[PDB]
Amino acid sequence: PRKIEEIKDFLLTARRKDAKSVKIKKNKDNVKFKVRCSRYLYTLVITDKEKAEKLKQSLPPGLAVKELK
Amino acid sequence: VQRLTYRRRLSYNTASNKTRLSRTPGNRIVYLYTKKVGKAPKSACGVCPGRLRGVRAVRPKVLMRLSKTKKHVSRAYGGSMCAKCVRDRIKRAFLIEEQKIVVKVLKAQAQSQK
Amino acid sequence: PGRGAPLAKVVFRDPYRFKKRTELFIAAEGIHTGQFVYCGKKAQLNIGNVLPVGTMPEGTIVCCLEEKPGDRGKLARASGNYATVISHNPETKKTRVKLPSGSKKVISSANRAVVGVVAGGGRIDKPILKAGRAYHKYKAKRNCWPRVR
Amino acid sequence: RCRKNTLARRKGRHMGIGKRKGTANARMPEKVTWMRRMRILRRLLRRYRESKKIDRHMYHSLYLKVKGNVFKNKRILMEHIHKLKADKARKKLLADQAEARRSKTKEARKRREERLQAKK
Amino acid sequence: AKRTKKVGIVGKYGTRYGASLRKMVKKIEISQHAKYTCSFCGKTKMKRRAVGIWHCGSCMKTVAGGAWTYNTTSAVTVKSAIRRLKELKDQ
RNA sequence: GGUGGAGGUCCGUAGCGGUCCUGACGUGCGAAUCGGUCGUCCGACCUGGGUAUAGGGGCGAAAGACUAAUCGAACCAUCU
RNA sequence: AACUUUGAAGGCCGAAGUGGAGAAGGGUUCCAUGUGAACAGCAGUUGAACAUGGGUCAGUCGGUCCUGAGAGAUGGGCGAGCGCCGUUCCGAAGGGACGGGCGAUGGCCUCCGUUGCCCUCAGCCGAUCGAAAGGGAGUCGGGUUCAGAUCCCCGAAUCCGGAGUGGCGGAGAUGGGCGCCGCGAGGCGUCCAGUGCGGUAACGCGACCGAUCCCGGAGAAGCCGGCGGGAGCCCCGGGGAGAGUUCUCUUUUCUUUGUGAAGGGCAGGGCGCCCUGGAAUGGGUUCGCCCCGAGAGAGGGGCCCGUGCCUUGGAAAGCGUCGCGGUUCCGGCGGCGUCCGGUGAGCUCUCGCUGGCCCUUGAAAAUCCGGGGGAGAGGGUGUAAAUCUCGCGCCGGGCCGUACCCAUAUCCGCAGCAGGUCUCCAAGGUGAACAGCCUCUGGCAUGUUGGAACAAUGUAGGUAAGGGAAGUCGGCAAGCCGGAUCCGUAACUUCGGGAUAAGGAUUGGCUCUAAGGGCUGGCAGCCGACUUAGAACUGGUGCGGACCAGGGGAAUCCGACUGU
Ligand SMILES: [Mg+2]
Ligand SMILES: [Mg+2]
Ligand SMILES: [Mg+2]
Ligand SMILES: [Mg+2]
Ligand SMILES: [Mg+2]
Ligand SMILES: [Mg+2]
Ligand SMILES: [Mg+2]
Ligand SMILES: [Mg+2]
Ligand SMILES: [Mg+2]
Ligand SMILES: [Mg+2]
Ligand SMILES: [Mg+2]
Ligand SMILES: [Mg+2]
Ligand SMILES: [Mg+2]
Ligand SMILES: [Mg+2]
Ligand SMILES: [Mg+2]
Ligand SMILES: [Mg+2]
Ligand SMILES: [Mg+2]
Ligand SMILES: [Mg+2]
Ligand SMILES: [Mg+2]
Ligand SMILES: [Mg+2]
Ligand SMILES: [Mg+2]
Ligand SMILES: [Mg+2]
Ligand SMILES: [Mg+2]
Ligand SMILES: [Mg+2]
Ligand SMILES: [Mg+2]
Ligand SMILES: [Mg+2]
Ligand SMILES: [Mg+2]
Ligand SMILES: [Mg+2]
Ligand SMILES: [Mg+2]
Ligand SMILES: [Mg+2]
Ligand SMILES: [Mg+2]
Ligand SMILES: [Mg+2]
Ligand SMILES: [Mg+2]
Ligand SMILES: [Mg+2]
Ligand SMILES: [Mg+2]
Ligand SMILES: [Mg+2]
Ligand SMILES: [Zn+2]
Ligand SMILES: [Zn+2]
Structure with a gap:
């Protein structure tokens, strides 16, 4: 697994062809965006709920979004 | 105290079967089979007892996976010979040639006198 | 192993092909590493140097002698x-040439x-003090040590 | 029951002459005792060197004295350090007073010779 | 402190092997473990590896010497005779 | 007075071996075992596997010992 | 129903086990259902018995590959002969590949592959076999079965091979001069350069052309001692959750209190790595060592292992409790918690440093990598090229074994035989101890049976007034001494030993005193450890209270000894 630091690199990762799905793990004081590529599972840890809500609308419609609970 | 067994059929404590203890997220202790400890390369001169630096000390068939800069150092005789013996070999390759020039000049002076 | 004499890896430069040869010389006493051992007919007379017997003068202490010209060293080694x-x-x-047994032998000068x-x-x-030292002596050499009368 | 016994063991009980099966070297070995005493006294001299309290020469001499089994602990070693401090203080005070008297004498001789070369 | 009177390195052998044999072993056993001053660097680092092979700790420069000592007297006389014959050939 | 830890060093666990009780057993647990006492336990130590030496042969720190419960000449078949 | 099953009680094996797992070997003995004909030296409702059925899932675990000691073809030699010797020796022992030329085919005959011939190049070492513990790339966590799990399922990876048109980016990278236009930002035309960049250096960065050949490294190393780091386990002080006790006491006793592989970062170890600098009044430094004008201390840096902490994985899963369902068949659903610390010559594993020992010097090859060389390729300033060990993307990994026993019942001894058989894991106390004894996890029914009495002879344990070897071939057997601390220790000697010689004193419990240390700011504060010494009091002189555990001395003969 690889942790992405920037939002733009995570968006370019989710825009790729190997991205099977994206899932949202909402625990306390963190929001984790996981995207399943062919080789690695790329993760993004956002501490801001408003930034996570802004990023959640920025997902592409072709990629399968799953809110894990 | 959790006594625990091998996960192979090699039951002997051989150099191939070197282990370490590790705790799983299922809260139990188990062996993880350690890789054998690779060593850094030794110098091509063979006078220094120490090993070279800037080269990853690992088993040799792993070196297909390493990049180019991980296996040597950016220098003449990089990854093969240490820098002290490199600069001494440069000094020697200069000074023996200069001594040959001095011998050639003395031979020309011997032909000039004779 | 199984030899009182220490050996020496002497690296030669092949005159016909570009390849460094290596040889197992019997190291005489006084040879150190990083020494230029010469070998040939026109070589000098000093320790760490092999030259034919016809060129060396009288009373020369030599070892690793050949009984015949070509067999890479047989006598006094x-x-x-x-x-x-x-x-x-x-x-x-x-x-x-007289040998360390004391026998005088007529050997060709080639x-x-x-x-x-x-060395x-x-x-x-x-003295070997004990059967352990004698056992480790002959175990490296060959099975001849349990000498039953 | 083990805790109730080991509290008395910490107090110093059930450890007499009778309830002792191993030797002194078996129970608390003299090699490890020498190790502990060296690890104490060497770092003690190292702290007193790094705190500018002792100098390098007296450090090296007392280091050899620590190695040669002079001091059995830290307290008499501190007392020996302070005794050498008092001795070097008295010797340095007498040496500075002698050097001051010698410098006063030499400067008085220099001024006397200056007055002689100024007059004649 | 002086521990033993007239037995040195052979005190590891105990009462065994005989007094004259331990006295004959003693000098050789001291001479093979006595560190020698190197002729190349000068540092007292000539440690015996095995029979006839001595090693310097500083230069890492291995010298083929004697079995129990560094230079034997026979080898010194041989080196003197060889340099005399070399000078007699050279003139 | 310390440090050091060398030894075909000592007591001694495992391991290897088998002195004595000529104990038990002796149509036995057992065609060689058991109990206590014992020798040794850092090196002539113990040990699996692979391999090599085959019968007037092998191998033997040597007892004519061992060589598949068989050894002063193994076992199987033939002459018989 | 004495033996089967369950519950309760009392016991044992008492972590070098009667526990949990392997190798050889066994071969269905593994699991379920049914039977009690035969076997399990009594019985059995039971079984490893019988009869029906099931059970072993792999690129990553091994074999497969390599070579060791060795075995064994070809040439050659020998032999009446099956054949034998021999393994580099009386051999034309290569079928491989860079580049160039020629013709023939295949694909938008562009440009390249395939083959055919010729020129040219080349050393190797002996065909082949030989380790399920040697070398050998790369898989871990959770769940699931009546029986299989690093193999099945889910979630994370990772190794090798292929990759034509190269599937995508990044490197090779796009700079400079001159001459014009434009107020400028900037834009055109020509000329070269450009197979990377930075640091004094150790060396670093994401790649950073390259052949025949050569050099080197890894593979690739003994035994022992000492020390240090890091894990797993143990110990102590607390927070939580559930249980035990609670006729008296106990902020009490028991269990649990976590996070893999593969990346990134940071502690922590190691350096015989570099720069400034020149040191005697010698200094630095270890348990010991050891180091230094061939450069020590003191500063500033660099590299390696980083199995340890944080983070991605990852709380979703695992576990401890509490509560609701599905009447069931259910990776059911939910609340909480999975916390803070300190220690130790403690046991085991691993890493590193340093020494000692050898008339012992402690393996090869498969395979991989680095470098020196510079034969050759690229493109003329770009919609650039040859070339990539950089980040991704796609496909594939064939064959065999995998169940179980692994030993007082699955192996070998004619057998459920007190024999034999190679390894790993290794808690608490007492104690020097991995000794003996008791206990916790796990396991079991006392080892081919039970009941009733306690006769003689037995076998295995013991105890005996008085004498103390008078018994007997013979102190045979049994018994005495035994641990630790403080004294003291002879003849003789190879001066090392004898020696724990011999001969004495003490040992319990309780209550104290003294001494032996770290962190922070000769002083003050805060904390953690086991020892050593001394004193008092006291018990029916009892105290290494069980266990563990030397009888000794003086002589003679033989063999030195350790060993067999
Ligand atoms: Mg293996
Ligand atoms: Mg961990
Ligand atoms: Mg490098
Ligand atoms: Mg023999
Ligand atoms: Mg000592
Ligand atoms: Mg011994
Ligand atoms: Mg009998
Ligand atoms: Mg009978
Ligand atoms: Mg029986
Ligand atoms: Mg003994
Ligand atoms: Mg024969
Ligand atoms: Mg024998
Ligand atoms: Mg006889
Ligand atoms: Mg006969
Ligand atoms: Mg078992
Ligand atoms: Mg089992
Ligand atoms: Mg069954
Ligand atoms: Mg029956
Ligand atoms: Mg043959
Ligand atoms: Mg093979
Ligand atoms: Mg193998
Ligand atoms: Mg320095
Ligand atoms: Mg959870
Ligand atoms: Mg180059
Ligand atoms: Mg299995
Ligand atoms: Mg039985
Ligand atoms: Mg018992
Ligand atoms: Mg019984
Ligand atoms: Mg019974
Ligand atoms: Mg009596
Ligand atoms: Mg009496
Ligand atoms: Mg009598
Ligand atoms: Mg007796
Ligand atoms: Mg005596
Ligand atoms: Mg006599
Ligand atoms: Mg004897
Ligand atoms: Zn070097
Ligand atoms: Zn030197």
Whole structure:
């Protein structure tokens, strides 16, 4: 697994062809965006709920979004 | 105290079967089979007892996976010979040639006198 | 292993092909590493140098001698042994050399030997104190030690 | 029951002459005792060197004295350090007073010779 | 402190092997473990590896010497005779 | 007075071996075992596997010992 | 129903086990259902018995590959002969590949592959076999079965091979001069350069052309001692959750209190790595060592292992409790918690440093990598090229074994035989101890049976007044001494030993005193450890209270000894 630091690199990762799905793990004081590529599972840890809500609308419609609970 | 067994059929404590203890997220202790400890390369001169630096000390068939800069150092005789013996070999390759020039000049002076 | 004499990896440069040869010389006493051992007919007379017997003068202490020209060293090549040149003979190219047994032998002047005494000399001066030292002595050499009368 | 016994063991009980099966070297070995005493006294001299309290020469001499089994602990070693401090203080005070008297004498001789070369 | 009177390195052998044999072993056993001053660097680092092979700790420069000592007297006389014959050939 | 830890060093666990009780058993647990006492336990130590030496042969720190419960000449078949 | 099953009680094996797992070997003995004909030296409702059925899932675990000691073809030699010797020796022992030329085919005959011939190049070492513990790339966590799990399922990876048109980016990278236009930002035309960049250096960065050949490294190393780091386990002080006790006491006793592989970062170890600098009044430093004008201390840096902490994985899963369902068949659903610390010559594993020992010097090859060389390729300033060990993307990994026993019942001894058989894991106390004894996890029914009495002879344990070897071939057997601390220790000697010689004193419990240390700011504060010494009091002189555990001395003969 690889942790992405920037939002733009995570968006370019989710825009790729190997991205099977994206899932949202909402625990306390963190929001984790996981995207399943062919080789690695790329993760993004956002501490801001408003930034996570802004990023959640920025997902592409072709990629399968799953809110894990 | 959790006594625990091998996960192979090699039951002997051989150099191939070197282990370490590790705790799983299922809260139990188990062996993880350690890789054998690779060593850094030794110098091509063979006078220094120490090993070279800037080269990853690992088993040799792993070196297909390493990049180019991980296996040597950016220098003449990089990854093969240490820098002290490199600069001494440069000094020697200069000074023996200069001594040959001095011998050639003395031979020309011997032909000039004779 | 199984030898009182220490050996030496002498690296030669091949004159016909670009490849460094290596040889197992018997190290005479006084040879250190990083030394230029010369070898040939026109070589000098010093320790760490092999030259033919017809070129060396009288009373030269040599070891690793050849009994015949070409067999890469046969005579006087155990630890601390040496053979000495007694006299030469220009006609028929022969030379008298006495061996460490004491025998005087007529050997041709074509063959060669390294100069000096073999390193590891005086090895038989220290007594083997015990059967353990004798067991480890002969275990490396060959099965001949349990000598039953 | 083990805790109730080991509290008395910490107090110093059930450890007499009778309830002792191993030797002194078996129970608390003299090699490890020498190790502990060296690890104490060497770092003690190292702290007193790094705190500018002792100098390098007296450090090296007392280091050899620590190695040669002079001091059995830290307290008499501190007392020996302070005794050498008092001795070097008295010797340095007498040496500075002698050097001051010698410098006063030499400067008085220099001024006297200056007055002689100024007059004649 | 002086521990033993007239037995040195052979005190590891105990009462065994005989007094004259331990006296004969003693000098050789001291001479093979006595560190020698190197002729190349000068540092007292000539440690015996095995029979006839001595090693310097500083230069890492291995010298083929005697079995129990560094230079034997026979080898010194041989080196003197060889340099005399070399000077007699050279003139 | 310390440090050091060398030894074909000592007591001694495992391991290897088998002195004595000539104990038990002796149509036995057992065609060689058991109990206590014992020798040794850092090196002539113990040990699996692979391999090599085959019968007037092998191998033997040597007892004519061992060589598949068989050894002063193994076992199987033939002459018989 | 004495033996089967369950519950309760009392016991044992008492972590070098009667526990949990392997190798050889066994071969269905593994699991379920049914039977009690035969076997399990009594019985059995039971079984490893019988009869029906099931059970072993792999690129990553091994074999497969390599070579060791060795075995064994070809040439050759020998032999009446099956054949034998021999393994580099009386051999024309290569079928491989860079580049160039020629013709023939295949694909938008562009440009390249395939083959055919010729020129040219080349050393190798002996065909082949030989380790399920040697070398050998790369898989871990959770769940699931009546029986299989690093193999099945889910979630994370990772190794090798292929990759034509190269599937995508990044490197090779796009700079400079001159001459014009434009107020400028900037834009055109020509000329070269450009197979990377930075640091004094150790060396670093994401790649950073390259052949025949050569050099080197890894593979690739003994035994022992000492020390240090890091894990797993143990110990102590607390927070939580559930249980035990609670006729008296106990902020009490028991269990649990976590996070893999593969990346990134940071502690922590190691350096015989570099720069400034020149040191005697010698200094630095270890348990010991050891180091230094061939450069020590003191500063500033660099590299390696980083199995340890944080983070991605990852709380979703695992576990401890509490509560609701599905009447069931259910990776059911939910609340909480999975916390803070300190220690130790403690046991085991691993890493590193340093020494000692050898008339012992402690393996090869498969395979991989680095470098020196510079034969050759690229493109003329770009919609650039040859070339990539950089980040991704796609496909594939064939064959065999995998169940179980692994030993007082699955192996070998004619057998459920007190024999034999190679390894790993290794808690608490007492104690020097991995000794003996008791206990916790796990396991079991006392080892081919039970009941009733306690006769003689037995076998295995013991105890005996008084004498103390008078018994007997013979102190045979049994018994005495035994641990630790403080004294003291002879003849003789190879001066090392004898020696724990011999001969004495003490040992319990309780209550104290003294001494032996770290962190922070000769002083003050805060904390953690086991020892050593001394004193008092006291018990029916009892105290190494069980266990563990030397009888000794003086002589003679033989063999030195350790060993067999
Ligand atoms: Mg293996
Ligand atoms: Mg962990
Ligand atoms: Mg590098
Ligand atoms: Mg033998
Ligand atoms: Mg000591
Ligand atoms: Mg011994
Ligand atoms: Mg009997
Ligand atoms: Mg009977
Ligand atoms: Mg029986
Ligand atoms: Mg013994
Ligand atoms: Mg024969
Ligand atoms: Mg024998
Ligand atoms: Mg006889
Ligand atoms: Mg006969
Ligand atoms: Mg078992
Ligand atoms: Mg089992
Ligand atoms: Mg069954
Ligand atoms: Mg029956
Ligand atoms: Mg043959
Ligand atoms: Mg093979
Ligand atoms: Mg193998
Ligand atoms: Mg320095
Ligand atoms: Mg959870
Ligand atoms: Mg180059
Ligand atoms: Mg299995
Ligand atoms: Mg039985
Ligand atoms: Mg018992
Ligand atoms: Mg019974
Ligand atoms: Mg019974
Ligand atoms: Mg009596
Ligand atoms: Mg009495
Ligand atoms: Mg009598
Ligand atoms: Mg007796
Ligand atoms: Mg005596
Ligand atoms: Mg007599
Ligand atoms: Mg004897
Ligand atoms: Zn070097
Ligand atoms: Zn030197």
